[PDB]
From a paper:
In contrast, multi-step phosphorelays comprise at least one additional Rec (Recinter) domain that is typically part of the HK and acts as an intermediary for phosphoryl-shuttling. Here, to test for distinguishing features of Recinter domains, we analyze the structure and dynamics of the C-terminal Rec domain of the well-studied HHK CckA (CckARec) and find, quite unusual, its active site in the active conformation and indeed no allosteric response upon beryllofluoride modification. Rec domains of HHKs are intermediaries in phosphorelays in that they shuttle the phosphoryl group between DHp or Hpt partners.
The crystal structure of the Rec domain of CckA (CckARec, residues 568–691) was determined to very high resolution (1.25 Å resolution) by molecular replacement. The structure is defined by continuous electron density from residues 570 to 689 except for residues 654 to 663, with some poor density but not clear enough to model the linker segment reliably. CckARec exhibits the canonical (β/α)5 fold of Rec domains with a central five-stranded parallel β-sheet and the β-strands connected by cross-over helices. However, the cross-over segment from β4 to β5 (β4–β5 linker) is partially disordered and not folded into a canonical α4 helix. The asymmetric unit of the CckARec crystals contains one Rec monomer and no significant interfaces are formed within crystal lattice (all interface area <275 Å2). Indeed, as measured by SEC-MALS, CckARec was found to be monomeric in solution up to concentrations of around 1 mM. Unexpectedly, the divalent cation binding site is not occupied, with the closest water (W739) at a distance of 1.7 Å from the site. Though the CckARec structure has been determined in absence of the phosphoryl-mimic beryllofluoride and shows no bound divalent cation, the active site is clearly in the activated conformation. Like activated PhoBRec, CckARec shows (1) a closed β3–α3 loop with main-chain carbonyl 625 (55 in PhoBRec) in place for Mg++ coordination and (2) the side-chain hydroxyl of S651 (T83 in PhoBRec) in the inward position ready for forming an H-bond with an incoming BeF3− - moiety. We note, that one of the two alternative conformations of the aromatic switch residue F670 coincides with the inward orientation as seen in activated PhoB.
Numbering used by the authors: 571 to 653, 665 to 689
The structure:
């Protein structure tokens, strides 16, 4: 499954991305919404899931969704934070077992 994972905190993003790759997903990482929007455009219609932090330097995750939803098609979207159809919310700190369960549910 091709996941676009948008998270400004490098160590949080990298852990989650590596653990998702260990489960067989392709994970395209972005550190901000402006990078994510370019990735979404260049991969339009091939992304299966967007996972995004809510509050990030630059545009927030929900604004990214508004800009990127067309490139994402019907892909589900999962927002994450320590604080439109197919939109879910997972609190931080992220538990990998729960993250993997939710990714699987949204993709199946």
């Amino acid at each position: 499954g091709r996941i676009l994972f948008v998270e400004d905190e490098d160590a949080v993003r990298s852990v989650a991305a590596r653990l998702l790759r260990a489960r067989g997903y392709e994970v395209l990482e972005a550190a901000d919404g402006e990078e994510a929007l370019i990735i979404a455009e260049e991969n339009a219609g091939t992304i299966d899931l967007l996972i995004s932090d809510v509050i990030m330097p630059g545009i927030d995750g929900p604004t990214l969704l508004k800009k990127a939803r067309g490139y994402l098609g019907t892909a589900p979207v999962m927002f994450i934070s320590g604080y439109e159809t197919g939109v879910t919310f997972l609190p931080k700190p992220i538990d990998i077992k729960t993250l993997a369960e939710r990714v699987k549910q949204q993709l199946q």
